[PDB]
Structure 1
Amino acid sequence: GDVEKGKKIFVQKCAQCHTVEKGGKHKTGPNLHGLFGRKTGQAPGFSYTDANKNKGITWGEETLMEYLENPKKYIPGTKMIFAGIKKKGEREDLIAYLKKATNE
């Protein structure tokens, strides 16, 4: 995916609920720093739904690709209000940006 295109997508559709940097505050949604390689619902200090905490998968390019296409379908009961991103390419770009931004 194209990191720059993904940055634009993040800023327009995710930033209002999520920060990606280390130490970034939790907002409506949890801070995403360290996302890749971590299990669902493990960011300290954020009140996740039990649905998210119990999904039990590990966040990575593959799991994110599915989750972002339709959040509610992948994690029934999640309190994340987001319809999903239909275009495969857009999800690829966004995930490429997340892979970088949540690890710097």
Structure 2
Amino acid sequence: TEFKAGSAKKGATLFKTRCLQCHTVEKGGPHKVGPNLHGIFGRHSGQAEGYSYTDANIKKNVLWDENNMSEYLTNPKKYIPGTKMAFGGLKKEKDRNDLITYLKKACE
């Protein structure tokens, strides 16, 4: 595949600093500023229950795979204009590979 495989051990440290504050991981995770990230790979956009999404997030209805994710994580407002997720965006492809590597197993 086009993306590479990174390290979940340095992909989790990247999550605990940059994602964990807005997103949880494990089953039945509490909804924070952002929704719970579990089973995100294989489901459409903004389809997790009990959360209030902006229109634009649901409208694109893209199916989160390991590649289009890295596109959204490098520029969250560019991939989905009007999103209420406030994030600077990852500019290092390593950081994108390492995180998704972790997200793949963390979100099984």
Amino acid aligned to 1:47? S
Superposed CA deviations along residues 8-48 of structure 1, whole A, max 9, x for unmatched, are 00000000000011100100000011111010000000000
Amino acid aligned to 1:90? D
TM normalised by structure 2 equals: 0.93
**Which position in structure 2 is the counterpart of 1:100?**
105
User: 1: distance between equivalents of 2:65 and 2:26?
Assistant: 17
Superposed CA deviations along residues 30-88 of structure 1, whole A, max 9, x for unmatched, are 00111110100000000000000111110110111100011000000000000100000
User: 2: distance between equivalents of 1:24 and 1:49?
Assistant: 20
Confirm whether residue 74 of structure 1 aligns to residue 84 of structure 2. no
**Gap regions ≥5 residues in structure 2:** 1-5
**Which position in structure 1 is the counterpart of 2:23?**
18
User: 2: distance between equivalents of 1:6 and 1:55?
Assistant: 27
Confirm whether residue 89 of structure 1 aligns to residue 58 of structure 2. no
Task: Report the number of matched residues.
Answer: 103
**Which position in structure 2 is the counterpart of 1:52?**
57
User: 2: distance between equivalents of 1:73 and 1:38?
Assistant: 21
**Which position in structure 2 is the counterpart of 1:33?**
38
Structure 1 runs of 4+ with >2 Å offset: none
**Gap regions ≥5 residues in structure 1:** none
User: 1: distance between equivalents of 2:42 and 2:75?
Assistant: 21
